[PDB]
Protein backbone atom coordinates (compact mmCIF):
# COMPACT_ATOMS: atom_id res chain seq x y z
CA UNK A 1 0.00 0.00 0.00
CA UNK A 2 2.92 2.57 0.74
CA UNK A 3 4.17 1.40 -3.02
CA UNK A 4 0.78 2.10 -4.22
CA UNK A 5 0.43 5.39 -2.69
CA UNK A 6 4.38 6.49 -3.79
CA UNK A 7 3.44 5.01 -7.28
CA UNK A 8 -0.24 7.22 -7.74
CA UNK A 9 1.76 10.34 -6.25
CA UNK A 10 5.26 10.20 -8.25
CA UNK A 11 1.74 9.41 -11.95
CA UNK A 12 0.35 12.66 -10.66
CA UNK A 13 4.00 14.83 -9.75
CA UNK A 14 5.29 13.55 -13.55
CA UNK A 15 1.62 14.11 -15.34
CA UNK A 16 1.52 17.92 -13.67
CA UNK A 17 5.28 18.68 -14.38
CA UNK A 18 4.82 17.77 -18.24
CA UNK A 19 1.82 19.98 -18.12
CA UNK A 20 3.66 22.82 -16.85
CA UNK A 21 7.13 22.32 -18.11
CA UNK A 22 5.74 23.46 -21.91
CA UNK A 23 4.26 26.80 -20.52
CA UNK A 24 7.74 28.44 -20.91
CA UNK A 25 8.96 26.29 -23.40
CA UNK A 26 6.44 25.75 -26.69
CA UNK A 27 4.97 29.65 -26.67
CA UNK A 28 8.36 30.65 -27.07
CA UNK A 29 9.69 28.63 -29.30
CA UNK A 30 6.44 28.72 -31.71
CA UNK A 31 7.20 32.55 -31.19
CA UNK A 32 10.68 32.42 -32.53
CA UNK A 33 9.86 29.55 -35.02
CA UNK A 34 7.55 31.89 -37.33
CA UNK A 35 9.89 34.57 -37.37
CA UNK A 36 -3.21 34.20 -35.28
CA UNK A 37 -0.34 32.69 -33.04
CA UNK A 38 -2.46 33.39 -29.95
CA UNK A 39 -5.48 31.40 -31.25
CA UNK A 40 -3.25 28.56 -32.61
CA UNK A 41 -1.55 28.40 -29.05
CA UNK A 42 -4.71 28.56 -27.06
CA UNK A 43 -5.90 25.59 -29.00
CA UNK A 44 -2.80 23.33 -28.66
CA UNK A 45 -3.03 24.00 -24.56
CA UNK A 46 -6.77 23.42 -24.60
CA UNK A 47 -6.81 20.67 -26.36
CA UNK A 48 -5.45 18.23 -23.68
CA UNK A 49 -7.85 19.39 -21.19
CA UNK A 50 -10.89 18.98 -23.81
CA UNK A 51 -9.43 15.29 -24.35
CA UNK A 52 -9.15 14.42 -20.90
CA UNK A 53 -12.53 15.69 -20.33
CA UNK A 54 -14.09 13.68 -22.91
CA UNK A 55 -12.20 10.48 -21.81
CA UNK A 56 -12.77 10.68 -18.58
CA UNK A 57 -16.38 8.88 -19.18
CA UNK A 58 -14.61 6.19 -21.08
CA UNK A 59 -12.16 5.20 -18.56
CA UNK A 60 -14.28 4.48 -15.65
CA UNK A 61 -16.31 2.17 -18.20
CA UNK A 62 -12.75 0.57 -18.66
CA UNK A 63 -11.71 0.34 -15.06
CA UNK A 64 -15.53 -1.24 -14.23
CA UNK A 65 -15.01 -4.17 -16.69
CA UNK A 66 -10.97 -4.74 -16.54
CA UNK A 67 -9.73 -3.14 -12.96
CA UNK A 68 -7.09 -0.36 -12.20
CA UNK A 69 -3.52 -1.54 -13.15
CA UNK A 70 -4.19 -1.81 -16.84
CA UNK A 71 -5.35 1.29 -17.34
CA UNK A 72 -2.42 2.72 -14.93
CA UNK A 73 0.31 1.12 -17.26
CA UNK A 74 -1.25 2.09 -20.42
CA UNK A 75 -1.44 5.82 -18.97
CA UNK A 76 2.34 5.30 -17.92
CA UNK A 77 2.84 4.61 -21.54
CA UNK A 78 0.83 7.26 -23.60
CA UNK A 79 2.77 9.49 -20.82
CA UNK A 80 5.88 8.04 -22.29
CA UNK A 81 5.04 8.54 -26.13
CA UNK A 82 3.60 12.18 -25.16
CA UNK A 83 6.95 13.34 -23.67
CA UNK A 84 8.85 11.66 -26.30
CA UNK A 85 6.73 13.36 -28.95
CA UNK A 86 6.70 16.69 -27.17
CA UNK A 87 11.48 15.93 -26.85
CA UNK A 88 11.27 15.72 -30.72
CA UNK A 89 8.72 17.28 -32.72
CA UNK A 90 9.41 20.84 -34.13
CA UNK A 91 5.81 21.09 -35.99
CA UNK A 92 2.40 22.59 -34.83
CA UNK A 93 0.28 19.28 -35.47
CA UNK A 94 3.05 17.21 -33.68
CA UNK A 95 3.15 19.54 -30.73
CA UNK A 96 -1.04 18.99 -31.01
CA UNK A 97 -0.94 15.32 -31.34
CA UNK A 98 1.35 14.97 -28.23
CA UNK A 99 -0.47 17.48 -26.39
CA UNK A 100 -3.92 15.67 -26.96
CA UNK A 101 -2.34 12.14 -26.06
CA UNK A 102 -1.21 13.53 -22.47
CA UNK A 103 -5.25 14.10 -22.00
CA UNK A 104 -5.36 10.34 -22.56
CA UNK A 105 -2.76 9.04 -20.39
CA UNK A 106 -3.69 11.42 -17.58
CA UNK A 107 -7.82 10.72 -17.50
CA UNK A 108 -6.46 7.13 -16.94
CA UNK A 109 -3.54 7.39 -14.65
CA UNK A 110 -5.86 9.85 -12.89
CA UNK A 111 -8.75 7.55 -12.70
CA UNK A 112 -7.32 4.93 -12.04
CA UNK A 113 -4.62 5.53 -9.88
CA UNK A 114 -7.45 7.04 -7.55
CA UNK A 115 -9.61 4.42 -7.53
CA UNK A 116 -6.95 1.94 -6.63
CA UNK A 117 -6.14 4.15 -3.59
CA UNK A 118 -10.01 4.94 -2.45
CA UNK A 119 -10.21 1.02 -2.62
CA UNK A 120 -7.06 -0.42 -1.15
CA UNK A 121 -7.38 1.61 1.94
CA UNK A 122 -10.44 0.77 4.36
CA UNK A 123 -10.07 2.32 6.82
CA UNK A 124 -11.22 6.16 6.30
CA UNK A 125 -9.22 7.62 8.32
CA UNK A 126 -6.49 6.20 6.92
CA UNK A 127 -8.13 6.47 3.40
CA UNK A 128 -8.24 10.63 3.69
CA UNK A 129 -4.95 10.84 4.64
CA UNK A 130 -3.43 8.71 1.64
CA UNK A 131 -5.37 10.59 -0.85
CA UNK A 132 -4.36 13.90 0.83
CA UNK A 133 -0.53 12.94 0.34
CA UNK A 134 -1.15 11.69 -2.78
CA UNK A 135 -3.19 14.56 -4.78
CA UNK A 136 -0.93 16.88 -3.15
CA UNK A 137 1.49 15.49 -5.65
CA UNK A 138 -0.25 17.60 -8.63
CA UNK A 139 0.97 21.13 -6.62
CA UNK A 140 4.29 19.90 -6.08
CA UNK A 141 4.22 18.73 -9.81
CA UNK A 142 2.88 22.04 -10.54
CA UNK A 143 5.80 23.88 -8.81
CA UNK A 144 8.77 22.12 -9.82
CA UNK A 145 7.92 22.51 -13.45
CA UNK A 146 8.54 25.61 -15.46
CA UNK A 147 11.72 26.87 -13.03
CA UNK A 148 13.42 22.91 -14.57
CA UNK A 149 11.97 23.16 -17.75
CA UNK A 150 13.17 27.07 -18.53
CA UNK A 151 16.11 26.32 -16.74
CA UNK A 152 16.97 23.33 -19.08
CA UNK A 153 15.56 25.09 -21.99
CA UNK A 154 17.88 28.10 -21.56
CA UNK A 155 21.04 26.27 -20.76
CA UNK A 156 21.18 22.69 -22.69
CA UNK A 157 18.44 23.12 -25.53
CA UNK A 158 14.67 22.49 -25.95
CA UNK A 159 14.71 18.68 -25.92
CA UNK A 160 16.61 17.92 -22.40
CA UNK A 161 14.02 18.67 -19.56
CA UNK A 162 11.45 16.21 -22.30
CA UNK A 163 14.24 13.65 -22.08
CA UNK A 164 14.70 13.55 -18.54
CA UNK A 165 10.83 13.80 -17.87
CA UNK A 166 10.82 10.45 -20.38
CA UNK A 167 13.17 8.68 -18.13
CA UNK A 168 11.91 9.45 -14.97
CA UNK A 169 8.43 7.96 -16.59
CA UNK A 170 10.48 5.16 -17.21
CA UNK A 171 11.29 4.80 -13.89
CA UNK A 172 7.80 4.95 -12.56
CA UNK A 173 6.84 2.24 -15.30
CA UNK A 174 9.38 -0.02 -13.93
CA UNK A 175 8.67 0.26 -10.26
CA UNK A 176 5.01 -0.68 -11.58
CA UNK A 177 6.66 -4.11 -12.69
CA UNK A 178 7.65 -4.51 -9.12
CA UNK A 179 4.69 -3.16 -7.41
CA UNK A 180 1.27 -3.86 -9.66
CA UNK A 181 1.94 -6.98 -12.06
CA UNK A 182 -0.34 -4.47 -14.67
CA UNK A 183 -1.16 -8.34 -15.82
CA UNK A 184 -3.47 -8.90 -13.20
CA UNK A 185 -6.98 -8.50 -14.55
CA UNK A 186 -9.55 -6.99 -10.94
CA UNK A 187 -13.18 -6.67 -10.80
CA UNK A 188 -14.62 -3.45 -9.35
CA UNK A 189 -17.64 -2.18 -8.04
CA UNK A 190 -19.83 0.82 -8.41
CA UNK A 191 -21.75 3.27 -5.42
CA UNK A 192 -22.54 6.57 -4.35
CA UNK A 193 -24.53 8.98 -6.77
CA UNK A 194 -24.15 9.34 -10.36
CA UNK A 195 -22.47 12.52 -11.35
CA UNK A 196 -24.99 13.83 -13.69
CA UNK A 197 -27.22 13.79 -10.73
CA UNK A 198 -25.04 16.15 -8.48
CA UNK A 199 -24.28 18.62 -11.28
CA UNK A 200 -28.21 19.68 -11.27
CA UNK A 201 -28.04 20.50 -7.91
CA UNK A 202 -27.86 24.81 -7.64
CA UNK A 203 -25.37 24.61 -4.78
CA UNK A 204 -22.73 22.20 -6.34
CA UNK A 205 -23.24 24.25 -9.16
CA UNK A 206 -21.70 27.41 -7.84
CA UNK A 207 -18.96 25.42 -5.91
CA UNK A 208 -17.48 23.76 -8.76
CA UNK A 209 -18.32 27.71 -11.12
CA UNK A 210 -16.15 29.23 -8.11
CA UNK A 211 -13.14 26.69 -8.74
CA UNK A 212 -13.46 26.66 -12.48
CA UNK A 213 -13.60 30.25 -12.70
CA UNK A 214 -10.87 31.28 -10.03
CA UNK A 215 -8.34 28.28 -12.06
CA UNK A 216 -9.47 29.66 -15.68
CA UNK A 217 -8.18 32.94 -14.30
CA UNK A 218 -4.56 31.13 -14.56
CA UNK A 219 -5.89 28.93 -17.62
CA UNK A 220 -5.69 31.85 -19.72
CA UNK A 221 -2.61 33.05 -17.95
CA UNK A 222 -0.61 30.05 -19.10
CA UNK A 223 -0.37 29.92 -22.83
CA UNK A 224 -0.14 34.23 -22.74
CA UNK A 225 2.19 35.71 -20.21
CA UNK A 226 5.13 33.95 -22.08
CA UNK A 227 3.98 35.79 -24.92
CA UNK A 228 3.05 39.06 -23.28
CA UNK A 229 6.86 39.04 -21.48
CA UNK A 230 8.67 40.00 -24.90
CA UNK A 231 7.16 43.55 -24.14
CA UNK A 232 10.13 43.54 -21.51
CA UNK A 233 12.78 41.43 -23.86
CA UNK A 234 12.57 39.12 -21.43
CA UNK A 235 15.31 36.12 -21.31
CA UNK A 236 14.74 32.55 -20.45
CA UNK A 237 17.37 32.12 -18.23
CA UNK A 238 15.86 32.23 -14.90
CA UNK A 239 13.04 34.51 -15.85
CA UNK A 240 9.69 32.87 -18.12
CA UNK A 241 9.08 29.76 -15.36
CA UNK A 242 10.43 31.94 -12.57
CA UNK A 243 7.54 34.43 -13.35
CA UNK A 244 5.34 31.54 -12.62
CA UNK A 245 7.18 30.40 -9.59
CA UNK A 246 5.72 32.71 -7.02
CA UNK A 247 2.11 31.55 -7.95
CA UNK A 248 3.32 28.29 -7.37
CA UNK A 249 4.82 28.86 -4.25
CA UNK A 250 1.89 31.24 -2.86
CA UNK A 251 -0.43 28.47 -3.60
CA UNK A 252 1.48 26.42 -1.20
CA UNK A 253 1.68 28.39 1.36
CA UNK A 254 -2.08 30.06 1.18
CA UNK A 255 -3.07 26.04 1.04
CA UNK A 256 -1.33 24.79 4.60
CA UNK A 257 -2.53 28.27 6.06
CA UNK A 258 -6.10 28.10 4.62
CA UNK A 259 -6.80 24.48 5.21
CA UNK A 260 -6.63 24.99 9.21
CA UNK A 261 -8.05 28.74 9.02
CA UNK A 262 -11.23 28.02 7.13
CA UNK A 263 -13.00 26.11 9.45
CA UNK A 264 -12.77 28.65 12.27
CA UNK A 265 -13.33 31.72 10.10
CA UNK A 266 -16.09 30.40 7.83
CA UNK A 267 -15.06 28.13 4.35
CA UNK A 268 -17.84 30.48 2.25
CA UNK A 269 -16.36 34.02 3.60
CA UNK A 270 -12.85 32.09 2.73
CA UNK A 271 -14.16 30.83 -0.69
CA UNK A 272 -15.61 34.76 -1.28
CA UNK A 273 -12.24 36.53 -0.07
CA UNK A 274 -9.99 34.59 -2.28
CA UNK A 275 -11.93 34.86 -5.34
CA UNK A 276 -11.87 38.92 -4.57
CA UNK A 277 -8.01 38.55 -4.04
CA UNK A 278 -8.28 36.58 -7.35
CA UNK A 279 -9.67 39.33 -9.75
CA UNK A 280 -7.40 41.93 -8.24
CA UNK A 281 -4.37 40.71 -8.41
CA UNK A 282 -5.22 39.49 -11.87
CA UNK A 283 -6.10 42.93 -12.40
CA UNK A 284 -3.07 44.37 -11.36
CA UNK A 285 -0.94 41.68 -13.29
CA UNK A 286 -0.88 43.71 -16.93
CA UNK A 287 0.35 46.90 -15.02
CA UNK A 288 4.03 45.43 -14.21
CA UNK A 289 6.92 46.08 -16.85
CA UNK A 290 9.25 44.09 -15.70
CA UNK A 291 10.05 40.81 -14.26
CA UNK A 292 10.36 41.97 -10.54
CA UNK A 293 6.66 43.66 -10.98
CA UNK A 294 5.73 40.44 -11.25
CA UNK A 295 6.26 38.45 -8.16
CA UNK A 296 3.52 40.55 -6.19
CA UNK A 297 0.79 39.71 -8.42
CA UNK A 298 1.61 36.27 -9.17
CA UNK A 299 1.94 35.66 -5.21
CA UNK A 300 -1.68 37.03 -4.40
CA UNK A 301 -3.30 35.01 -7.50
CA UNK A 302 -1.27 31.50 -5.91
CA UNK A 303 -2.40 32.75 -2.53
CA UNK A 304 -5.93 33.31 -3.37
CA UNK A 305 -6.84 30.30 -5.59
CA UNK A 306 -5.58 28.07 -2.98
CA UNK A 307 -7.85 30.26 -0.73
CA UNK A 308 -10.74 29.42 -2.44
CA UNK A 309 -9.44 25.34 -3.21
CA UNK A 310 -9.19 25.26 0.67
CA UNK A 311 -12.25 26.27 1.38
CA UNK A 312 -14.40 25.29 -1.59
CA UNK A 313 -13.39 21.06 -1.56
CA UNK A 314 -14.92 20.63 2.30
CA UNK A 315 -17.81 22.77 1.19
CA UNK A 316 -18.26 20.24 -1.85
CA UNK A 317 -17.74 17.40 0.66
CA UNK A 318 -20.35 18.63 2.84
CA UNK A 319 -22.75 19.55 0.44
CA UNK A 320 -22.56 15.90 -1.13
CA UNK A 321 -23.01 14.16 1.94
CA UNK A 322 -25.88 16.55 3.21
CA UNK A 323 -27.60 16.34 0.02
CA UNK A 324 -27.13 13.08 -1.76
CA UNK A 325 -25.95 9.69 -0.80
CA UNK A 326 -21.87 10.50 -0.99
CA UNK A 327 -19.02 8.38 -1.95
CA UNK A 328 -15.32 8.97 -1.53
CA UNK A 329 -14.46 9.87 -5.18
CA UNK A 330 -17.69 12.36 -5.83
CA UNK A 331 -15.53 15.26 -4.82
CA UNK A 332 -12.82 14.27 -6.88
CA UNK A 333 -15.04 13.56 -9.65
CA UNK A 334 -16.84 17.32 -9.52
CA UNK A 335 -13.80 18.59 -8.91
CA UNK A 336 -12.04 17.55 -11.65
CA UNK A 337 -15.13 18.03 -13.63
CA UNK A 338 -14.38 21.77 -12.90
CA UNK A 339 -10.88 21.74 -13.80
CA UNK A 340 -11.34 20.35 -16.80
CA UNK A 341 -13.71 22.41 -18.02
CA UNK A 342 -11.60 25.72 -16.83
CA UNK A 343 -8.65 24.55 -18.63
CA UNK A 344 -10.52 23.61 -21.68
CA UNK A 345 -12.23 27.00 -21.76
CA UNK A 346 -9.45 29.16 -20.64
CA UNK A 347 -7.28 29.24 -23.49
CA UNK A 348 -9.62 28.66 -26.61
CA UNK A 349 -11.43 32.11 -25.60
CA UNK A 350 -8.35 33.40 -24.12
CA UNK A 351 -6.58 33.34 -27.59
CA UNK A 352 -9.04 35.20 -29.13
CA UNK A 353 -9.92 37.74 -26.64
CA UNK A 354 -6.36 38.59 -27.11
CA UNK A 355 -6.24 38.74 -30.92
CA UNK A 356 -9.62 41.30 -30.43
CA UNK A 357 -8.55 43.64 -27.33
CA UNK A 358 -4.92 42.50 -26.53
CA UNK A 359 -3.54 40.76 -23.34
CA UNK A 360 -4.33 44.00 -20.61
CA UNK A 361 -8.00 43.67 -21.61
CA UNK A 362 -8.01 39.85 -21.41
CA UNK A 363 -6.64 40.11 -18.04
CA UNK A 364 -8.92 42.60 -17.11
CA UNK A 365 -12.64 40.26 -18.31
CA UNK A 366 -10.79 37.83 -16.08
CA UNK A 367 -10.52 39.32 -13.21
CA UNK A 368 -13.73 41.59 -13.23
CA UNK A 369 -15.83 38.43 -13.74
CA UNK A 370 -13.69 36.51 -11.09
CA UNK A 371 -14.79 39.67 -9.23
CA UNK A 372 -18.58 39.53 -10.10
CA UNK A 373 -19.07 35.65 -9.17
CA UNK A 374 -17.75 36.35 -5.12
CA UNK A 375 -21.39 36.97 -4.30
CA UNK A 376 -22.73 33.94 -5.49
CA UNK A 377 -20.96 32.09 -2.49
CA UNK A 378 -23.50 34.10 -0.06
CA UNK A 379 -25.67 31.02 -1.09
CA UNK A 380 -23.51 28.39 0.32
CA UNK A 381 -23.51 30.49 3.85
CA UNK A 382 -26.20 27.68 4.85
CA UNK A 383 -27.27 25.52 2.28
CA UNK A 384 -31.02 23.24 3.10
CA UNK A 385 -30.98 19.29 3.09
CA UNK A 386 -33.51 17.95 0.51
CA UNK A 387 -36.05 15.19 0.67
C1 LIG B 1 -5.02 21.45 -14.28
O1 LIG B 1 -4.73 21.47 -12.86
C2 LIG B 1 -3.44 21.47 -12.53
O2 LIG B 1 -2.55 21.46 -13.34
C3 LIG B 1 -3.26 21.50 -11.04
C4 LIG B 1 -2.97 22.93 -10.53
C5 LIG B 1 -4.02 23.96 -10.94
C6 LIG B 1 -3.62 25.33 -10.43
C7 LIG B 1 -2.41 25.86 -11.03
N1 LIG B 1 -2.01 25.58 -12.32
C8 LIG B 1 -0.81 26.23 -12.56
C9 LIG B 1 0.00 26.24 -13.69
C10 LIG B 1 1.18 26.97 -13.64
O3 LIG B 1 1.92 26.94 -14.79
C11 LIG B 1 3.13 27.69 -14.81
C12 LIG B 1 1.55 27.66 -12.49
C13 LIG B 1 0.74 27.64 -11.37
C14 LIG B 1 -0.45 26.92 -11.38
C15 LIG B 1 -1.49 26.67 -10.42
C16 LIG B 1 -1.65 27.11 -9.00
C17 LIG B 1 -3.04 26.76 -8.50
N2 LIG B 1 -3.48 25.39 -8.93
C18 LIG B 1 -2.51 24.34 -8.45
C19 LIG B 1 -2.83 22.95 -9.00
C20 LIG B 1 -4.06 22.33 -8.33
C21 LIG B 1 -4.18 20.90 -8.81
O4 LIG B 1 -5.28 20.23 -8.13
C22 LIG B 1 -5.09 19.85 -6.85
O5 LIG B 1 -4.09 20.10 -6.22
C23 LIG B 1 -6.25 19.09 -6.32
C24 LIG B 1 -6.29 18.73 -4.98
C25 LIG B 1 -7.34 17.97 -4.50
O6 LIG B 1 -7.46 17.56 -3.20
C26 LIG B 1 -6.44 17.94 -2.29
C27 LIG B 1 -8.36 17.57 -5.36
O7 LIG B 1 -9.39 16.78 -4.89
C28 LIG B 1 -10.52 17.50 -4.41
C29 LIG B 1 -8.32 17.93 -6.71
O8 LIG B 1 -9.34 17.46 -7.48
C30 LIG B 1 -9.27 17.71 -8.88
C31 LIG B 1 -7.27 18.69 -7.18
C32 LIG B 1 -4.45 20.87 -10.31
O9 LIG B 1 -4.51 19.52 -10.74
C33 LIG B 1 -5.81 19.06 -11.06
Redesign the pocket.
Given at each position: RKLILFIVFLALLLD?ML??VV?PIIPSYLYSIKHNENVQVGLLFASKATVQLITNPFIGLLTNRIGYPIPIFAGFCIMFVSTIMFAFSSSYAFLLIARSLQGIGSSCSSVAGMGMLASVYTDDEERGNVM?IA??G??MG?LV??PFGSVLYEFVGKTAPFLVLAALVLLDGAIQLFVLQPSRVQPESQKGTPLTTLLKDPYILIAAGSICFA?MG?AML?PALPIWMMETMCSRKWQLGVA?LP??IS?LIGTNIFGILAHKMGRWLCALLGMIIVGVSILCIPFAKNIYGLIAPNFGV?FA??MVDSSM?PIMGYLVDLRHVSVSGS??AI??VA?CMG?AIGPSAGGAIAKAIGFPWLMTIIGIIDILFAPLCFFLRSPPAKE
Open positions: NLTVGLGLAVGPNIEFASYGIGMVYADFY
